[PDB]
Design a protein around this ligand. Structure first.
Ligand SMILES: Nc1ncnc2c1ncn2[C@H]1C[C@H](O)[C@@H](COP(=O)(O)OP(=O)(O)OP(=O)(O)O)O1
Ligand SMILES: [Cr+3]
Ligand code: NA
Ligand code: NA
Length: 327
DNA sequence: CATTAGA
DNA sequence: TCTAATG
């Protein structure tokens, strides 16, 4: 956690670098299980060999470890960090829309900077177009103070279109969290469950509403179940406008909201921990349901959910307020 | 790990 | 169809 830290992080940087700048998934994979195992190691790694004894620790990695332990740096590391080319892919990548692949190509053609991106907007696709447009606002945190405002709006139109809509803004925001990155609104409706052959419009109607009133301003990607866009809080009485924000609304078969909700609420650990728990307690939990476990090793059969509760109950746990789902 | 764009 | 990018 801190005794193995430097090693891990160097490794992760290492790992990372392969995966993007280079097209080396394998090495990249190498760096991770290693960085994975060495992390759990109960003692201060003190030399490569020591490290080496470890499963996943090759001769190569070890060699790096020594040089890092011996000298507070790493060459390949300093050299990467420096390397303008790699620097660029690492950068371009920030654009929502851009990924490693396209990052390398942009470079290959010469677009290293944001500006280049500008002059060559032609070369970018609508997603990345919006990516480039709101570059700044995309990086910004979302003050819960605003979360309340957006959340507020979203609920109204939802209900305003059809009262049957249920809707939750999941994420850190649900978890209290002073700020959040993007807004996750979960959604469902009775008339839409497991079997009941969809009702696309379901999603569509709202998307239309929120836009209608100018909440949603940009569409990054709308599907029959997953809408992904840009929104922005009304700019009051001029002098202060709102930063354009990332937003995702997802349609759900009401017969699996809860789990889904539970799930997206997090945290990463609470889930996991909660998940591991249901196991002993003879169950299984995942993004959409909770099934009773069978001794034959495994088994099916989806239990019935009415609220975050039922689930809690099932595994016979103590209801954890979102606020406290932190771990 | 599943859902969308695009080509 | 597959291949990228988001989550
Ligand atoms: C998984 C992790 C979360 O529980 C959930 C998705 O939330 P995620 O998209 O990561 O929210 P977030 O961290 O991106 O945004 P936020 O800023 O709202 O917390 O599913
Ligand atoms: Cr989010
Ligand atoms: Na080994
Ligand atoms: Na990106």
């Amino acid at each position: 956690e801190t005794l193995n830290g430097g090693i891990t992080d160097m490794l992760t940087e290492l790992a990372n670098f392969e995966k993007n700048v280079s097209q080396a998934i394998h090495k990249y994979n190498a760096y991770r299980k290693a960085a994975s195992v060495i992390a759990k190691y109960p003692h201060k790694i003190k030399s490569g060999a020591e490290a080496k004894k470890l499963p996943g620790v090759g001769t190569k990695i070890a060699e790096k470890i020594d040089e890092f332990l011996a000298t507070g740096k790493l060459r390949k590391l300093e050299k990467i960090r420096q390397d303008d080319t790699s620097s660029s892919i690492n950068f371009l990548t920030r654009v929502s829309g851009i990924g490693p692949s396209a990052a390398r190509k942009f470079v290959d053609e010469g677009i290293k900077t944001l500006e280049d991106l500008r002059k060559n907007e032609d070369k970018l696709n609508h997603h990345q177009r919006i990516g480039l447009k709101y570059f700044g606002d995309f990086e910004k945190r979302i003050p819960r103070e605003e979360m309340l405002q957006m959340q507020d709006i979203v609920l109204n139109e939802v209900k305003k279109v059809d009262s049957e809509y249920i809707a939750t803004v999941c994420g850190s925001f649900r978890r209290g969290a002073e700020s959040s990155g993007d807004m996750d609104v979960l959604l469902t409706h009775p008339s839409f469950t497991s079997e009941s052959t969809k009702q696309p419009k379901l999603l569509h109607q709202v998307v239309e509403q929120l836009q209608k009133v100018h909440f949603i301003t940009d569409t990054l990607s709308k599907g029959e179940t997953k809408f992904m866009g840009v929104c922005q809080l009304p700019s009051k009485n001029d002098e202060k406008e709102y930063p354009h924000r990332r937003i995702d609304i997802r349609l759900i078969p009401k017969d699996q909201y809860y789990c889904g909700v539970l799930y997206f609420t997090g945290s990463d650990i609470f889930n996991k921990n909660m998940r591991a728990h249901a196991l002993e307690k003879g169950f299984t939990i995942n993004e959409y349901t909770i099934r009773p476990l069978g001794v034959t090793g495994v088994a099916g059969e989806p239990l019935p959910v009415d609220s975050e509760k039922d689930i809690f109950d099932y595994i016979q746990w103590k209801y954890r307020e979102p606020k406290d789902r932190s771990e």
